[PDB]
Design a protein around this ligand. Structure first.
Ligand SMILES: O=P(O)(O)c1ccccc1
Ligand SMILES: O=P(O)(O)c1ccccc1
Ligand SMILES: O=[N+]([O-])c1ccc(O)cc1
Ligand SMILES: [Mg+2]
Ligand SMILES: [Mg+2]
Ligand SMILES: [Zn+2]
Ligand SMILES: [Zn+2]
Length: 228
């Protein structure tokens, strides 16, 4: 029988799915965490792990059974358990992993396994193409410090979709979540930069809420303005 801790999948576009897994840090309750699976020709690319290696394995199994194409690579959007909690699974599966250079530097401080490869960014925010080879439709943008110093974002070329990770909250959210590692001065402008980077994206995907309109960007930025 399917159970609560099992990952759930939603098709967002012909070649894109959202995976959601409900994980559980002590002190606090369990929370849902989302990433993406993208079909690019004869291969699959992932954005973020699940919050645990077990749930990540269950995703790779689903991918194998439902898509049956090899996962060529994964890009993980910052060094916290929810996005990088499944690095061991990805590496056991032979998947090439990519993260912000900064994420890889923070990973041992945050108790997560670093990605194999480091992305660097121009002063514009855009990934340097020599660090993101054969990314296909994944367009990686560093919007500046927000949720964390290292948080990155991903646009999906040929689609409606951009992925904001834990940077973005949905249009009904009443909080930005945990701010203990947030850059409260830069958060608002970073959210706006993400918006300006992906102006064609009408479907905003994010870590802890279901996909929303571009009003999630505005709503998140205007909550963040109150922190300055
Ligand atoms: O994450 P789920 O797709 O199982 C969900 C949960 C409550 C309402 C709608 C969808
Ligand atoms: O969204 P955060 O990266 O603050 C988080 C959420 C659940 C578990 C660990 C980290
Ligand atoms: O054999 N494995 O790499 C495993 C085994 C169990 C698990 O939950 C995840 C990965
Ligand atoms: Mg683990
Ligand atoms: Mg920490
Ligand atoms: Zn985080
Ligand atoms: Zn998160």
């Amino acid at each position: 029988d399917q159970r609560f801790g099992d990952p759930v999948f939603r098709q967002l576009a012909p070649n894109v799915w959202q995976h959601t897994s409900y994980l559980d840090m002590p002190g606090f309750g369990a929370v849902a965490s989302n990433g993406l699976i993208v079909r690019d020709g004869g291969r699959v690319l992932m954005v973020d792990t699940a919050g645990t290696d077990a749930q990540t394995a269950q995703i790779l199994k689903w991918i194998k059974q439902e898509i049956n194409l090899p996962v060529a690579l994964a890009v993980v959007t910052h060094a916290h358990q929810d996005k990088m909690g499944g690095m061991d699974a990805l590496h056991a599966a032979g998947i090439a992993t990519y993260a912000n250079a900064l994420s890889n530097q923070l990973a041992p401080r945050e108790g997560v396994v670093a990605a194999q490869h480091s992305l660097t960014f121009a002063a514009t925010g855009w990934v340097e193409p020599a660090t993101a080879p054969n990314f296909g439709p994944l367009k990686v943008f560093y919007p500046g410090p927000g949720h964390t110093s290292d948080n990155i974002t991903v646009g999906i070329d040929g689609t409606d979709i951009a992925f904001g990770g834990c940077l973005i909250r949905d249009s009904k959210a009443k909080s930005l979540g945990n701010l203990d590692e947030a850059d409260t001065e830069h958060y608002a402008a970073s959210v706006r930069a993400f918006g300006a980077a992906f102006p064609k994206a009408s479907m905003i995907v994010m870590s802890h809420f279901a996909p929303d309109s571009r009003a999630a960007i505005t709503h998140t930025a205007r909550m963040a303005d109150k922190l300055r």
